[PDB]
Each structure stands twice: as C-alpha cells, then as structure tokens.
C-alpha cells in the first residue's frame, strides 16, 4: 500500500485535525434538499438569467447541489472551480465577502476564502448552496453562498488521461475510471439501459421472469468446465451453474408457458477479450414455439434494443476487429443459412460431396487443428469442425446458422423433415462471435435419455472430458411432460460489447477477473 | 435407484407410445401455432354473452385455439368432459363422438376419435385444443373441441392430491409436481415475480441505476458470514462467492454514481432452516447525500408500495404461521420507529442504561438460554445486542425500524451525529419476528474505517472458529479517493416474498431450495 507514504496523502490527512479543530466535521451526515447538476442545467441553461451582479444581489435562482471538486483556481478576492456530479459539471465562484464555509465561525482564525484555498483540495466532495448566473461567454455558473465540506479526500484525483499501465490498474480500481472518463461512464449507462430494454421487450411478450439456483448438485445445459464449492451444512460438493436451461425446462413442465431468466453463469475457462469466467446471460423458453419462432423473437429483440439506443437506426459501427472498423446492420430479418450452406458459401467446401476421410484431409491440411481432434471424429463432428475453422471468423454481419449436426447437442429435436442427423438448432453470429444458441426443444423423454447416455459414453472415452452423470430429475420431469417449446440463450455482455463499441469484455464489466499482484 | 421406471403405470403409458405412432401421430410434435393463453380467453369472454352448448355445436360461438395439461376427464357415453390447465388458469373442455377430431388420426384408422381420446390419452398429457366457447348450465366457461392435438405424451401420472409431510418434501425437489398440483404454490411464485418487477419500478423511479457486480471475488465482506470458496482454473486462484453487495457498490459511489442498486444472489455458507437458504436474493441500494433517516423513509415507502400494488391498494396482510397464531400486519408507512434501547425497555422489560454490565450479564444468565461463553466477557454494546436478540426480536410482529445499534454490531457505519460514539446510525427493519432490512448512514472516514476493521481483526483473532480475514485494501483506497456521505440499505427479498405470500418457510418462495441427500 504505497500511497500511505505519498506526500499528498500525509499532507491531506494532516488537514483533518486542522479542520476538526475549526469545529468542522469533514465527513458529515447528509446534504438534503438539493438538485442534480444535470437537472439544474436542464432547468436553467436554456433560460433568461442574470449576470454575476444579479447573483451578488441574490436576485437569480438559488440552488443546492453537491459533487467532487475537479478544478480550482484562486484569483485573490475570487476563486473559481468545477464541480463534477454524476457525469455533469458546473462552474462555481467563491468570493471573499459573499462565500461562507459551513461550520467556520466568524471569529475563527482563518477567512472563508483562505479556508477554501488551504484546507480543501481537488478531489474533495462539496455541498454548494448559491445563486445562478451566466458569464458573458455563456458558462452557467454558481456564486457560492455556502460551501459545505462533505468528504475530505485523502489522495489526489486520478490522472484524467490514463496511459496503458493506468488503464490496466483501473480495471481493478474502477472508481478512477468512473471519475476520469466520460466514455467509461457512457458505456456502463448504456449497459444498464440495455438490461432495461431486454426486460421491457420480454415482459411485453408475456415472458415471466424467474430465478433459479446458481449452486446445484449437477451442472449442464452447456459444454464447460465448472466451478466447484463445498456446502458446509450438508458436507456436499456443489457446482455453480454453467447455464440456465435445465431449471427453466422444469418450470415448463411446471405449467409456465413463457419464462426467462437473466443471471450470472460460471464457466471455469480461460480469460480474453470475449471471455470472463463469470458472465451474464438470458435464457428464455416459450411453450408451443419452435426454433423458427425463436429466430424471429431473437432478431426482433436485438433490433428493438438497437433502435432504442440509436434514434431508430439499425446500423451500428464496431471499431476493434483486426480487419478494421465495420458497420453492422441489425435490421430483421437477419441472414439465415444452414451450417452446410455457410461452409459452402464461406469455407468453399460443399460438404456432402466428400467422404468422411476427405473431410479429415481438409481439416488436416487446411487448418491448424491437432490430429486427435478429427482423426476419429464422426461425420457430423467433422462438419461442425469445418464450420469452426472455415466459417465462424467470417460471420461479421448478423447471421442465424441453422440445422447443426446431432453431435453438437443432446437437447434438441432432429429436423422435422426426418433427417435424424441434424437438429432444429440455430446459432446467431455477429462480428465473428457467437451471440445466441437456440433449439426446438427436445421433450421426448426416451429420446432424451438415449442422447444423454450417448453423450456420456462418448465423453467417458476422452481423458480431458468432465464426468458429469445423467440428470435423472430432469428426465423424470420430462416424463411428467414438457410441452413442445422453443428456447434461446444470449450472451448479454457480448451484446453490450457490440452496442457500445467495446474492444473487450473487460470494458463492459465494472470489475472483471484480473490477475493477483 | 429410479423407482418410476419399474412402476406399472410407467409401463402402461410408454406402451401407448408405439400405439400412437402406429396411428401416424407424433406424440411429441414440433409446435402448436396461433395458440392463445387460457387466461386471455377468459379475459375476453367470461364477462360476455355467449351461447349454450347447442350454439357451439352450430359453430356459432367464438372459436379459440389453446393448449395445456389435461387434469380431469370423465367420459359420458358419446360425450366426455375434461379440464385443461394452462399456466395457472383452468378451462373445461367437452369432446363429442361426432364433433371432435384427433389431429393426424385417419378416418380409415381402426379407432374412432372418441375412443382414441378415452384409450390413448391420459391425465397428464399436454393437448392442443381448437373449438367453440359456450357456458354450461351452471355458468362454467367450456370449449366444445373441434380438434384435439396431442402435444406431449406424459409417461407418469399427475401427482397425488394428498401429499403427506414426506410427499410434500419430495416436491421441494420435484417442484414441477408441486406447481402442477397446488394453486397456492403457483400463485406464490407468480406473486414473487410481480414483487421483483415492483422493486425495480420503484427504484427506477427514485432515479437509482441498476448495476451488476461480481459474485466471484478475491475477498469477501459487507456482512458476518462464512463464505463459499471455489477455485478459478485459469489463474490457479482461490475465490470467494460474495456474501453481500456492499463494498462493490460503495466503490461505484466513489466513482461518482449517485444512486445505484443491485438485485442478485448472495451466498452464506451457514445452516438451513425456515428462514435460511445458503443462496438467497437481496437488493442493496445506495444514495449519495442521504442518511439512515432518508433510507428509512425509502424502505417503508418501497414495501408499502409493493403491498398496495399487490392487494388492490390495501396495506394489511394476513400471515398464518407464527406460533402466536394467525396475525394481520399493516405495512402502512411510517413504520414504528424505536432505538434498540427503547425496544429492550418496551418489549424486554430492561432499561439497559440503569444497569451495569454485570447486571446485563445476570439478566442474560437467568432470563435466556445463552451459553455463558456468549456473554461472560462481552462488551456492554455486545451485551445490549444479545438482550435485543433474546428479549425483543421475536416480539416484533408489526413492521419496526430498530435504530441506533451498538458500534460492535458493524464496522461499516457512522456513529451517532449526537456524538455518542458507542452507537451507530444503523437501523434494521423487522416484521413477523424476522429481520428484513439493514441500513446505514454509511461510513466514509477512511481512517475510522481502517480503525474499525482492525479492531474487528483483533476481536476475530481471538476466535479460533473464524479464519483470518484481511482488510480489503482497495476498498480503503477508494474511500481515500472519497466517498460522498451516503445512505444504503439491504433487503432480504425472499423473506419479503414470504411475508406477502403467507409462506411458512423460505423453501416455499424458492423454486429449488437446498435439500439434504
Ligand atoms: O457470451 C458468451 N458466449 C456466447 C453464448 O454461448 C453464451 C451462452 C448462450 F447465451 F446460451 C449462447 C451464446 C460468453 C461469454 C464469456 O465471458 C464466456 C466465458 C467462458 F469462460 C466461457 C464461455 C463464455 O461465453
Ligand atoms: O433475508 C435474510 N436476512 C435478512 C438480511 O440480513 C439479508 C441481508 C440484508 F438484506 F442486507 C439485510 C437483511 C436471509 C436469508 C437467508 O436465506 C440467509 C441465509 C444465511 F445462510 C444467512 C443469512 C440469511 O439471511
Ligand atoms: N443452455 C444453452 C442456451 C439455450 C439453448 C437453447 N435451449 C447454452 O448455454 O448454450
Ligand atoms: N451489506 C449489508 C446490507 C447493507 C447495509 C447498509 N450498508 C448486509 O449484508 O447486511
């Protein structure tokens, strides 16, 4: 903790005894009956309003507000400052004869203007009561009648313009980002706005929002390494959920026809520009829908969010791809292709012309996959691998990629046409990244067992594979009966990244996962 | 050992699968389109002139499409009558040998539509129904079914209507069965979702920004609890699951965010009972420039708003499960407000400030069951908190704010503005004998905060049941940057849901509470 020895800390802390000896509490209890700076600007900026002399004569509107002192200049009889309040700034003016310090007696040893000069500091949080006016240059300003010290800050303001090291530190010390950077402030406001837009759209579709456990005795609904923890009351290993799917499907068996949940899931994997081990996703299930109904719902949801954030526009610019800035159009309907078509269109491989061995030669010679990944892969697995290596990077515009091999998931019905090698699944891609996963949901309880047992026997032969056993409570609930349903999941942090031009998932998380010092 | 897979009725129902399929009917079809909710059918047509059964046979009444679970069925010769359950609403259905068709059943098939409905369908199956509305002689809204579609063949039967203690205890695990068979359980969980939407609506209208902060952290704090511990593979690092929301949100206030709240799960690795589940939902909210008196008004206004919105503008609520018998509690604001010392006098019979510590001890010895270890060396403030715990808390049935706690009860709270540094500007809200809310005039003096956390370390160092817990240094640095004066509260939302749904146990307001082996 190197700041405890910095000059500025020792200098500021020594002002505490000085301020308290003047009978002033440097950490008081409240600052009631005030207005937000932005609300003052909203009410009075576009207004006929007086000059400094009208404020000196107490003729202009009186206001109370509070915030952080981020600029100060003494001009003798007068001093000027800037107050930052919740992403808004306003100028303040102190005058030797007009301005008082709350708590500073008239017979104290120091004048108000010198108290302001010498006992306050940049970074201190002040309560300001005074009179509005406009400078002739047009700057909205407050002539301060009383300044109240609300918090004596003990370290200096952050460097406003962060170098690379400061930017890394501020992923932990996020308060320094929020004080310093209008852009970080907008990014997180937009994130909150996006969450409200999602809830509003879902609720207008009569989806009910629910909560289901993060700590479970099993984990499933996705392919991921889990987090493990011990519950002391039962002396039991628990897993943190990796998805929402199984719990929500039980609520369908329970009779709820439309449910969704927005919550954290945990995948104990690597960390990079698109991967934080703790992330936020929505899963939503609608009885009597299929993946086609889900496809219209997902693209309409996103278009609606984009239109609400961009004054009706559906085009959005994203600046940080290795290939340069791109403009992506979220206007529905999005591009729709089967996995097989996308491999043909973007990979240059018409898959159904090549035997399994030819598909391995393509993977072996045209990709950098290790031999163990394809040498014994089934035809469907080979097709999915071709998609991963030859297609996924190329899907910059929004795409729905449909009709995946059966091997990709055990929880999805096969194509209603009768092709049992493909499922009624789509994944949505934008900016080279997966955004959405969606199924015509499997509710045949015998078929569901068959697929999960198949998945367990296949996994049990891979050394690096996670042994989780069959969820029998899930199978029993399907025996009770799940309606036909369509479901989807959306990685919300990734979506926020697309709609805020964030280079990394760390820019949309207040406190992302960081290495220890 | 899965028991239903060996039960006669499982064999009985699975047998129908091949039979139905040999009729060319898919027992798990892909969708049921243009499907209305039953509740939406009732909303248009119950308060409505509607024909009788003969007008429905004439196809002259409104035609509807809907879906749900067959839960009652009685054949009456050429007619049969049933009840469909769709998402907490029920509607009666009528089949008729001449009027009703089974989707996908051929005329040249060897079974009639009515016999199919009798022989191949079961209570539990999920059906799609299209037909004409009418009123029975007794006034019941009914649908004469033109076409029934098998939407899901159920392989076990409806849950038994008479559940014992053990039959109901299995249903806390097998919650889908509870939801199917209990209207009280269905309504409890619908009320829970409404409560969550109402909390958000209220906080959003007070201009709080909703945020998310991490569950997985390198530290834990903001409450007294045993944490859950897990391992983050990518960093080979031990992590804690958050026990509260407080530290992360206070950092956001330092960042200049004036009003934030979060609704999410916290994890306390404690014992389980009617008011404790190791994973539970809370809201924390912080407002710059407020104190605990502002927070107190905010809390009671929020809860009164929720109660009023859920009970047609009433503020009184019935709760049935206290030992004292069925009560009625009024959530109308302002709630009863007392200091902890007043409450020990009013409800406990002890004027604490007329007693020495050793006399506070004698009281705890003779008038409670506390182990001598709990109080033999406790400080005066600690003695007073135990006197409250043992003599007052159970008696607070009507909503109370209990203010001005001993400093020992928390390290994160400012002391009384009167100058009494043995008490802090904290309140807890109680209702039905249970803590509901915890709130501070938040501590933002960095040196005082460090002092209080150090004294906690020394106190905890003497307990061999508490492992060593370092001081959150980044938190202290954020306070050094400067936190405004602030008021914050936390509310246990599950306990809140319990008090408004007449739930005996927290297990009743969670879909999947923690359960023994
Ligand atoms: O948004 C993400 N993925 C896209 C989805 O797969 C999310 C789940 C779905 F919403 F259901 C379908 C779309 C995402 C973000 C992460 O931070 C992350 C971290 C990991 F360790 C592992 C996977 C991760 O995945
Ligand atoms: O609602 C609860 N308590 C009330 C509060 O203390 C919650 C925190 C606050 F919201 F900040 C102020 C009010 C509650 C519910 C549990 O299931 C639970 C489980 C545990 F293992 C330990 C404590 C628990 O506490
Ligand atoms: N559980 C899926 C999301 C929903 C897929 C459709 N049921 C996942 O995590 O990928
Ligand atoms: N974090 C607190 C609630 C907020 C108290 C006021 N800052 C708790 O868990 O009890």
Q: Are strands B279-288 and B79-86 parallel, antiparallel or unpaired?
A: unpaired
CA of B285 relative to ligand 4 center, distance in Å: 9
Task: Answer whether A244 contacts ligand 1 (Cβ < 6 A).
Answer: no
Say whether A240 and B230 touch across the interface (CB within 8 A).
Answer: yes
Q: Give the whole-angstrom CA distance, residue A110 versus residue A132.
A: 27
- The answer to whether B225 touches B469, Cβ cutoff 8 Å, is no
- The answer to whether B250 touches B286, Cβ cutoff 8 Å, is yes
Task: Answer whether B61 contacts ligand 4 (Cβ < 6 A).
Answer: no
- The answer to whether B76 touches B94, Cβ cutoff 8 Å, is no
Q: Give the whole-angstrom CA distance, residue A228 versus residue A266.
A: 10
Q: Are strands A228-231 and A208-209 parallel, antiparallel or unpaired?
A: unpaired
Instruction: List CB contacts (< 8 A) between B512 and chain A.
Output: 212-213, 216, 247
- The answer to whether B28 touches A484, Cβ cutoff 8 Å, is yes
A195 touching chain B per CB within 8 A: yes
Q: Which residues of B participate in the annotated binding site?
A: 428, 435
Kindly report the protein residue whose alpha carbon is nearest to atom 3 of ligand 4: B490
What's the Cα-to-Cα distance from B177 to each of A108, A153, A392, B475, rounded to whole Å?
A: 75, 57, 42, 46
Q: Which residues contact B159 (CB under 8 A, 6 or more apart)?
A: B171, B177, B178, B180, B181
CA of A427 relative to ligand 3 center, distance in Å: 10
Per DSSP, the three-state class of B425 is strand
The string over A452-461, giving b where at least 16 C-beta atoms fall within 10 Å of a residue's C-beta and e elsewhere, is beebeeeeee
Say whether B209 and A192 touch across the interface (CB within 8 A).
Answer: yes
Which residues are B75's β-sheet partners?
B80
Q: What angle do CA B504, B506, B510 make, to 5 degrees?
A: 125
A467 touching chain B per CB within 8 A: no
Kindly report the protein residue whose alpha carbon is nearest to atom 3 of ligand 1: A491
Q: What angle do CA A367, A371, A372 make, to 5 degrees?
A: 130
Choose among A504, A478, A511: nearest CA to B156: A478
Instruction: List CB contacts (< 8 A) between A440 and chain B.
Output: 30-31
What's the Cα-to-Cα distance from A315 to each of A299, A427, A492, B471, rounded to whole Å?
A: 14, 21, 19, 48
Q: Which residues of B participate in the annotated binding site for Mg(2+)?
A: 428, 435
Q: How many CB atoms lie within 10 A of CB B98?
A: 10
Element spanning B454, H or E: helix B446-461
Kindly report the protein residue whose alpha carbon is nearest to atom 6 of ligand 4: B439
**H-only helix segments in A461-513:** 472-481, 492-499
Please tell me which residue of chain B has the smallest CA distance to A207: B193
- The answer to whether B143 touches B94, Cβ cutoff 8 Å, is yes
Q: Is A427 annotated as a binding residue?
A: yes
- The answer to whether A509 touches A493, Cβ cutoff 8 Å, is yes
Phi-psi region of B207 (alpha: psi -120 to 50; beta: other; left: phi over 0): left
Q: Give the whole-angstrom CA distance, residue B343 versus residue A445.
A: 58
What's the Cα-to-Cα distance from A504 to each of A495, A496, B319, B422, rounded to whole Å?
A: 12, 10, 50, 48
| Nearest-CA distance B305 → chain A (Å) | 20
Choose among B250, B226, B223, B221: nearest CA to B472: B221
Element spanning B514, H or E: none
- The answer to whether A428 touches A435, Cβ cutoff 8 Å, is yes
What does the DSSP assignment read for B47-75?
SS----HHHHHTT-SPEEEEEEEEEEEEE
Give the tokens for residue A186. Answer: 């907008």
- Contact residues, A window 32-71, toward B, CB-based 8 Å cutoff: 32, 34, 36, 66-68
Per DSSP, the three-state class of B434 is strand
Q: Which residues contact B63 (CB under 8 A, 6 or more apart)?
A: B130, B131, B132, B133, B146
DSSP count for chain A of H helices, then E strands: 16, 19
A277 touching chain B per CB within 8 A: yes
Choose among B179, B72, B147: nearest CA to A480: B179
Element spanning A235, H or E: none
Which of B177, B234, B482 minimises the CB distance to A270?
B234
Residues in chain B: 517
- Atom number of ligand 3 nearest to Cα A425: 6
Domains of chain B (ranges plus CATH)?
Answer: 6-160 (2.40.50.140), 161-515 (3.30.930.10)
Q: Which residues contact B415 (CB under 8 A, 6 or more apart)?
A: B407, B421, B422, B423, B424, B425
Q: How many CB atoms lie within 10 A of CB B183?
A: 11
A30 touching chain B per CB within 8 A: yes
* Resolution, expressed in angstroms to one decimal: 2.4
Task: Calculate the dihedral angle through the C-alpha atoms of A394, A397, A400, A403, rounding to the nearest 10 degrees.
Answer: -20
Task: Answer whether A437 contacts ligand 3 (Cβ < 6 A).
Answer: yes
A477 touching chain B per CB within 8 A: yes
Instruction: List CB contacts (< 8 A) between A289 and chain B.
Output: 31
Please tell me which residue of chain B has the smallest CA distance to A257: B87
Task: Answer whether A283 contacts ligand 3 (Cβ < 6 A).
Answer: yes
Q: Give the whole-angstrom CA distance, residue A243 versus residue A489.
A: 9
Q: Give the whole-angstrom CA distance, residue A484 versus residue A443.
A: 6
Give the tokens for residue A70. Answer: 């981020």
Element spanning B139, H or E: none
Interface with chain B: mutation pick from A149, A218, A287, highest number of B CBs within 10 Å: A287
What does the DSSP assignment read for B169-189?
HHHHHSHHHHHHH-HHHHHHH
Which residues are A90's β-sheet partners?
A83
Q: Give the whole-angstrom CA distance, residue A22 versus residue A214.
A: 53
Q: Sheet harboring B400-406: ordered strands across?
A: B209-210, B259-267, B279-288, B486-492, B434-441, B423-431, B400-406, B336-339
Choose among B23, B22, B20: nearest CA to B120: B20
Give the tokens for residue A83. Answer: 């107050």
B154 touching chain A per CB within 8 A: yes
What's the Cα-to-Cα distance from A481 to each of B12, B74, B156, B390, rounded to whole Å?
A: 15, 21, 8, 49
Choose among A204, A219, A202, A197: nearest CA to A261: A202
Q: Which residues contact A165 (CB under 8 A, 6 or more apart)?
A: none
Which of A32, A123, A443 minimises the CB distance to B482?
A123
> Dihedral of CA B395/B432/B177/A282: which sign?
negative
Q: For residue A281, which ligand has an atom nearest its CA?
A: 1
The string over A489-503, giving b where at least 16 C-beta atoms fall within 10 Å of a residue's C-beta and e elsewhere, is bbbbbbbbbbbbbbe
B103 touching chain A per CB within 8 A: no
Q: Read off the DSSP letter of residue B430.
A: E
Say whether A253 and B176 touch across the interface (CB within 8 A).
Answer: yes
Instruction: List CB contacts (< 8 A) between B88 and chain A.
Output: 255
- The answer to whether A215 touches A247, Cβ cutoff 8 Å, is no
Please tell me which residue of chain B has the smallest CA distance to A270: B234
Q: Give the whole-angstrom CA distance, residue B136 versus residue B91.
A: 12
B262 Cα distance to chain centroid: 16
Which residues are B487's β-sheet partners?
B287, B441
- Which structural technique was applied? X-ray
Which residues are B406's β-sheet partners?
B423
Say whether A254 and B180 touch across the interface (CB within 8 A).
Answer: yes
Per DSSP, the three-state class of A440 is strand
Q: Is A145 annotated as a binding residue?
A: no
Give the tokens for residue A242. Answer: 């990796």
- φ/ψ of A166, rounded to 5, equals -60, -40
Instruction: List CB contacts (< 8 A) between A445 and chain B.
Output: 155
CA of B155 relative to ligand 1 center, distance in Å: 34
What does the DSSP assignment read for A261-308?
EEEEEE-----BTTB-SEEEEEEEEEET--HHHHHHHHHHHHHHHHHH
- φ/ψ of A101, rounded to 5, equals -105, 125
Which of A177, A481, A510 minimises the CB distance to B69?
A481
A352 touching chain B per CB within 8 A: no
Q: Give the whole-angstrom CA distance, residue A330 versus residue A314.
A: 5
Ligand 2 pocket list (CB less than 6 A): B 225, 268, 270, 276-278, 280, 282, 435, 437-438, 490-492, 494-495, 506
Which residues are B219's β-sheet partners?
none
- Atom number of ligand 2 nearest to Cα B225: 22
Whether residue A333 has a cis bond before it, omega within 30° of 0: yes
B224 touching chain A per CB within 8 A: no
Which residues are B130's β-sheet partners?
B65, B147
């506390």: which residue's tokens?
A: B370
């390290």: which residue's tokens?
A: B411
- The answer to whether B513 touches B277, Cβ cutoff 8 Å, is yes
Residues in chain A: 517
Phi-psi region of B222 (alpha: psi -120 to 50; beta: other; left: phi over 0): left
Which of A250, A416, A473 minimises the CB distance to B30?
A416
Q: Which residues contact B404 (CB under 8 A, 6 or more apart)?
A: B339, B340, B341, B416, B423, B424, B425, B426, B427
Q: What angle do CA A193, A198, A203 make, to 5 degrees?
A: 125
A290 Cα distance to chain centroid: 29
Q: Which residues contact B285 (CB under 8 A, 6 or more apart)?
A: B203, B208, B259, B260, B261, B298, B488, B489, B490
Which residues are B231's β-sheet partners?
B238
Q: Give the whole-angstrom CA distance, residue B511 versus residue A151.
A: 45
Whether residue B96 has a cis bond before it, omega within 30° of 0: no
Give the tokens for residue B492. Answer: 């246990």
B511 touching chain A per CB within 8 A: yes
Give percent helix, percent strand, percent coil of chain B, each to the nearest 5: 35, 25, 40
Task: Answer whether A222 contacts ligand 3 (Cβ < 6 A).
Answer: yes
Instruction: List CB contacts (< 8 A) between A13 and chain B.
Output: 447
Quote the radius of gyration of chain B (alpha carbons, Å): 30
Task: Answer whether B53 contacts ligand 4 (Cβ < 6 A).
Answer: no
Q: Give the whole-angstrom CA distance, residue A384 versus residue A423.
A: 12
Q: Read off the DSSP letter of residue A398.
A: -
Choose among A295, A401, A387: nearest CA to A338: A401
CA atoms within 13 A on the CB side of B406: 18
CA of B215 relative to ligand 1 center, distance in Å: 17
Instruction: List CB contacts (< 8 A) between A505 and chain B.
Output: none
- φ/ψ of A266, rounded to 5, equals -135, 115
Q: Give the whole-angstrom CA distance, residue B327 versus residue B318.
A: 6
What does the DSSP assignment read for B237-255?
EEEEE-S-SHHHHHHHHHT
């539990």: which residue's tokens?
A: B124
Q: Give the whole-angstrom CA distance, residue A206 versus residue B36.
A: 12
Say whether A34 and B237 touch across the interface (CB within 8 A).
Answer: no
């Amino acid at each position: 903790v190197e700041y405890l020895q910095h000059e500025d800390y020792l200098y500021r802390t020594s002002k505490l005894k000085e301020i308290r000896d003047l009978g002033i509490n440097p950490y008081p209890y409240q600052y009631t009956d005030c207005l937000e700076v932005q609300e003052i600007r909203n009410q009075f900026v576009d207004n006929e309003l007086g000059d400094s002399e009208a404020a000196f004569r107490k003729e202009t509107p009186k206001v109370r507000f509070a915030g952080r002192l981020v600029l100060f200049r003494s001009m003798g009889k007068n001093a000027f400052g800037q107050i930052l309040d919740n992403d808004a700034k306003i100028q303040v003016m102190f005058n030797r004869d007009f301005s008082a310090v709350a708590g500073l007696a008239a017979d104290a040893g120091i004048s108000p203007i010198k108290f302001i000069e010498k006992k306050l500091d940049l970074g201190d949080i002040l309560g300001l009561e005074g009179y509005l006016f406009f400078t002739h240059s047009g700057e909205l300003t407050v002539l301060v009648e009383t300044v109240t010290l609300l918090c004596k800050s003990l370290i200096s303001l952050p460097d406003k313009h962060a170098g690379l090291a400061d930017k890394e530190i501020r992923y932990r010390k996020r308060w320094a980002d929020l004080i310093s950077s209008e852009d970080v402030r907008k990014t997180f406001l937009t994130r909150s706005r996006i969450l409200k837009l999602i809830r509003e759209y879902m609720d207008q579709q009569s989806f009910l929002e629910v909560e289901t456990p993060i700590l479970q005795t099993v984990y499933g609904g996705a392919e991921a390494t889990p987090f493990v923890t011990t519950l002391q009351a039962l002396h039991a290993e628990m897993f943190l959920r990796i998805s929402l799917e199984i719990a929500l499907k039980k609520l369908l068996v329970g009779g709820m026809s439309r449910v969704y949940e927005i919550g954290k899931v945990f995948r104990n994997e690597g960390i990079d520009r698109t991967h934080n081990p703790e992330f936020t996703m929505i899963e939503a299930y609608a009885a009597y829908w299929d993946y086609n109904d889900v496809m219209k719902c997902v693209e309409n949801l996103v278009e609606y969010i984009v239109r609400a954030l961009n004054n009706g526009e559906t085009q959005v610019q994203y600046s940080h791809l290795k290939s340069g800035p791109q403009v992506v159009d979220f206007k529905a309907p999005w591009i729709r292709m089967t996995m097989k078509e996308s491999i043909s269109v973007y990979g240059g491989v018409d898959v159904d012309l090549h035997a399994d061995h030819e598909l391995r030669k393509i993977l072996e010679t045209q990709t950098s996959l290790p031999e163990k990944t394809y040498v014994h892969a089934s035809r469907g697995e080979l097709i999915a691998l071709l998609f991963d290596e030859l297609v996924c990077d190329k899907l910059i515009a929004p795409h729905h990629i449909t009709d995946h091999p059966l091997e990709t998931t055990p929880l999805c019905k096969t194509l209603r046409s009768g092709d049992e090698t493909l499922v009624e699944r789509f994944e949505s891609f934008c900016l080279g990244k997966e955004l959405c996963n969606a199924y015509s949901e499997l509710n045949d309880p015998l078929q569901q067992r068959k697929l999960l047992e198949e998945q367990m026997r296949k996994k049990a032969l891979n050394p690096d594979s996670e042994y989780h056993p069959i969820d029998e409570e899930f199978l029993e609930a399907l025996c009770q009966g799940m309606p036909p349903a369509g479901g989807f999941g959306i990685g919300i942090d990734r979506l926020v990244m697309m709609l805020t031009d964030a280079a990394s998932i760390r820019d949309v998380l207040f406190f992302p996962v960081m290495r220890r010092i």
